[model samples]
Target chain A: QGEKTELIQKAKLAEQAERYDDMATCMKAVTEQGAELSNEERNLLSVAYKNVVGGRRSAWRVISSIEQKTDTSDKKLQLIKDYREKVESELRSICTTVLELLDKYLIANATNPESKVFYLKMKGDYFRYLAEVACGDDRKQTIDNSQGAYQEAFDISKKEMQPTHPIRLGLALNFSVFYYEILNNPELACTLAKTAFDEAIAELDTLNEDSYKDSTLIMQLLRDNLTLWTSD
Target chain B: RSMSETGT
Candidate 1:
């Protein structure tokens, strides 16, 4: 108890200083110690990993363009390719680490319908992230894994939650994004997003005062994605 | 609270 509390306090201090490495280290230690993470700790874990991987993603994109340069020497190109692969390996490590934590601690401990869907959605997201840089059989398997997770989350959200609920709407947003970006299915993405937005709009009048902003904000994103996808 | 994935 005291150890987890101490780590969390250090995590907060790191967050205050914008030291994500320290934050991730402390929070990750808490998980290693086998404590059930609260929602706030879960978010802290996500933010930590996201920021840690964000720069590598950017670097991956830049080197990817260089790797395509036709005028480059063969040896230089190979070096670039190897470096890119190294970056991808690091990203995969981060994704799998978080996925393991979610599967072992967070998802397993999800006691309510809402959190179950939320944890599953996050699982899908990490798989999709892995797919973004993977190739061959690994890529195909990650895609399938991502699809299954998102589909399950969507089904649960529809069965157990209101269309206007922020969690459900957020799932629609990310799952639709999976279709468009990861699955390369623009039509399906638009369809999924449109349905979520329209259904939520139908229930707009009954939205709780506290959730009004969150629900509406996600609804706007759904519409925005639809507009962009359909216009293309 | 709801957690959703964002960005690339």
Candidate 2:
């Protein structure tokens, strides 16, 4: 605890100076020690990666401000509001960091029956977000990027993880949502969510205690969403 | 980590 305290204290000090980069440095060092990172530390680390990976000192703050929820202090939320709209376009520029985050997650389990299915879900969402600001050709491509990543996660989960697994269900859920939202295909979304939900239920007999355990919450959301889409 | 993977 004493050794870890030094890194945390330094991180706090850097943030006091309003220097995320400096704070990020200390946070990275703390992550290296890796016990249980505080939510504040994780958010700081997220900000730093968003900033540094955004390429210059110019837009790092823009990078930092994007997708940041407004549940925090009003001061920072106001600071964020001015730049929020610019984030999508600005974010399209950080393609490498996006891929880097993907590869970083996959570093240990890089592809082919890897243990990183959940992380792929996040990666798919970024590609989906980037597709928003992308131009004609790039737009076409990154939209597919989103679809491809989600499908890849789903494929891997079905093969490697239990059928009723949250990772599998989550991949399915994310993709279905993308179809309804980003792709403007509510028909596909409803059908796909129903398929996933039903499969999870049908597999209950085959699923072990651990397999069923991970899927219980997601299964409810699947059922809930099915009603939501069909209610219309 | 090669910066090459960065499409930007």
Candidate 3:
């Protein structure tokens, strides 16, 4: 029991450190040693195991997408499609389990308005990711719907919560990048990107000047787009 | 783990 607990603890530490492969291996060991773990330990182990597996699957999907974009071979495209399908299956399973866990947690705890807003924003992100992979004319519509949903969440959060919240800034930056890089709507993209930069700057000016330094990463990204847009 | 769950 003690050994299993120790392994699970180590697995969580590995996860925190982003050593995904090590985390997966340790979690697998814990599961193999089953019946020795307490209920709490089992739950934690299950969540960690799912996270590690999901992370690898997600990485595979991303790498496959990159390969598909760069490779012209029919065989390579088919391989990428297969990998994407496998990753999608794994993601669906993980989402199911995680959502169940979230529901259980929410039911046992006090309700907060911010929780639903955050959940909707996360859902919007998932849909946007899917929209990017979707082909044909419908892809634009799908992306627009995702952006609209995220905008709704942003507006609600701004009205009810702190405008300088990290979630707000992060989501704005994500949408900015999506618009500029993926959608290729340079005018709208630049506008949204500027909005994100301005809010991020405002937050830094009031609280910590150093805050803008971290957000400079996103600013650099937007600047890269601006250069491309102007060069055309 | 079962063979069904092994790959992905």
Candidate 4:
């Protein structure tokens, strides 16, 4: 109970109880101690941040913030490359677990459409990270799979979830961003973004804007993205 | 981005 191994074990117990924040507290403390975690430990850390019950975007922020740590001189010295490589690799590992789990769920419950949508969403998320870390032919496959996942996720979400559903809008926003930023397909990006903006605005009455909820932020981003891309 | 953007 006095050392890092005990802390990691506590994190594992917290994760099993689905106490994601408590688990992440352990991970952050362990990380700050400057002790190197193995790939499996890093993946466990990533899953803790990612599985926090209500703070969905917190995981993305955590991953991106760690990724943004390296300075150019650090890169020139290739020091922080280990840091970046470790985080991305472990995130991919976490999502790959979720992907396999969703595959089994979807197979067992072939009648469930949300299973399909969830699977594709996870797939898109994994390949998005993969594209950042991978190169050459693997990079191409990652990009292709990412786009395919988002596009199919959007289709299923559109048909299954209501127009006002946050999942539908999230699919559109994510897919459009992939097209716009990663693939350099501005036309497809503009089209999808504009359509999603329109759909969200039309369905805004169905959504309660009581707080800065996920839908509200995503809808606002749809508008902001359109304005920025149009001016570009 | 040639310092046209922000830091890394």
Q: Which model scores highest in lDDT?
A: 1
TM-score of each prediction: 0.88, 0.58, 0.55, 0.61
lDDT for each residue of candidate 1 in A1-232, tens digit (9 for 90 to 100): 8888899899889988988888888888887776566778877776777777666777887888788874666768778889999998888888888899888887887888887898898888889888889889989999999999999999998998888988788889889888988888988888988898888889877776688877877887887777777776
Off by over 4 Å in 1: A33-35, A69-75, A206-208, B1-8
Residue runs of model 4 more than 4 Å from their true location after superposition: A1-76, A106-110, A204-213, B1-8
Per-residue lDDT of model 4, residues A168-215, tens digit only = 666677677777777888788889888887877787777745423867
List, residue by residue over A10-88, the lDDT tens digit for candidate 3. Answer: 8778868877567656755665552333444544544464455557555865767677586676667777777777776
Give the residue spans of candidate 3 off by over 4 A.
Answer: A1-12, A17-80, A91-117, A135-145, A161-164, A181-183, A202-205, A208-232, B1-8
Ranking by TM-score, best first?
A: 1, 4, 2, 3
Per-prediction DockQ, in order? 0.13, 0.02, 0.02, 0.06
In angstroms and one decimal each, the interface RMSD of every candidate reads 8.7, 16.0, 17.0, 9.7
The positional error of residue A232 in candidate 1, measured at the CA in angstroms, is 2.0
What fraction of the native alpha-carbon contacts across the interface, defined at 8 angstroms, is recovered by model 2? 0.00
- State the displacement of the C-alpha of residue A143, model 2, in Å, after optimal TM-score superposition: 0.4
Give the whole-model CA lDDT for all candidates, comma-separated.
Answer: 0.82, 0.62, 0.56, 0.64
Let me know the TM-score candidate 1 reaches against the reference structure: 0.88
Cα DockQ of the candidate 3 complex: 0.02
Better of 3 and 4 by lDDT: 4
Q: Per-residue lDDT tens digits of candidate 2, residues A1-232? A: 7867887788777767867567656766665563444545544555554444444423534445453546576666655655654554445555455466455443234444534565576578667656645668888888898888888777777778766766577667767777876687878988878888888787777666765654777766666666777777
Q: Against the true structure, candidate 1 has what lDDT?
A: 0.82
- Lowest lDDT 10-residue stretch of candidate 4 chain A: A52-61
True contacts kept of 4: 0.00
